[PDB]
Amino acid sequence: KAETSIGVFYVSEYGYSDRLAQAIINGITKTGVGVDVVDLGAAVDLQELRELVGRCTGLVIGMSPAASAASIQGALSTILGSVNEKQAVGIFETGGGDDEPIDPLLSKFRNLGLTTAFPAIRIKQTPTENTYKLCEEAGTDLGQWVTRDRLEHH
């Protein structure tokens, strides 16, 4: 009975995550689809985190630092076990220099049945406006997919 939303999970202030996620969110917003932002760096209630993922039709994940593995894996593992095959998920690199391998995570979601929301956004160089314009379009794509999924539901 909660508003149709897409969950955006990433570590705030890590690399260009803040701006990369914001661009994607702006693209989502255009479609009128809601969004819930969760900071992977800040401690979260595992049970409410499962509930949030549970009510999200779409998902967006930002890579975490390979330096905060121990502390971050708790939330990450929870998301992997709280997700369902009926949703779509997109993943972006941060350009922070300590990103965890994106591919391994991409494959974990695909193995679970989820659909890839958009081509995993990779950052090898400092983000440009063409970079953020790409995130914006990926955000829109997912937002449109979510809309079509809801309408294709009933």
Side-chain angles (χ1 to χ4, degrees):
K1 308 184 78 303
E3 296 187 353
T4 300
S5 179
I6 163 279
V8 179
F9 313 72
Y10 70 99
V11 41
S12 71
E13 313 204 35
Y14 168 45
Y16 294 95
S17 294
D18 283 24
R19 301 180 65 188
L20 290 171
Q22 184 56 231
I24 302 171
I25 294 175
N26 289 166
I28 292 173
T29 300
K30 291 186 187 180
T31 71
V33 171
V35 64
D36 292 80
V37 190
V38 181
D39 171 34
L40 292 177
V44 292
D45 185 307
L46 306 183
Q47 198 50 59
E48 82 176 9
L49 175 57
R50 293 198 177 67
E51 285 195 295
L52 163 44
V53 171
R55 66 173 176 71
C56 284
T57 307
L59 303 163
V60 182
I61 310 304
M63 302 311 298
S64 282
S68 303
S71 57
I72 208 93
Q73 277 146 169
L76 196 51
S77 294
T78 310
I79 295 176
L80 288 170
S82 300
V83 163
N84 77 76
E85 53 162 58
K86 297 278 294 178
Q87 50 204 184
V89 70
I91 299 174
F92 66 88
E93 293 196 334
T94 70
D98 202 8
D99 278 15
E100 196 71 59
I102 173 168
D103 293 297
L105 189 61
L106 232 38
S107 299
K108 287 190 178 190
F109 283 108
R110 175 167 294 177
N111 202 65
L112 293 177
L114 288 76
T115 71
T116 73
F118 42 73
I121 124 174
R122 303 165 182 282
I123 286 70
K124 313 113 60 180
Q125 302 175 290
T126 298
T128 61
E129 288 309 323
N130 290 159
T131 295
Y132 296 131
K133 183 193 304 299
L134 178 66
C135 299
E136 186 273 88
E137 189 47 41
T140 292
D141 281 16
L142 180 57
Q144 297 184 294
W145 181 89
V146 169
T147 300
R148 276 194 264 81
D149 184 90
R150 210 96 311 295
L151 306 182
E152 185 185 303
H153 210 60
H154 295 295

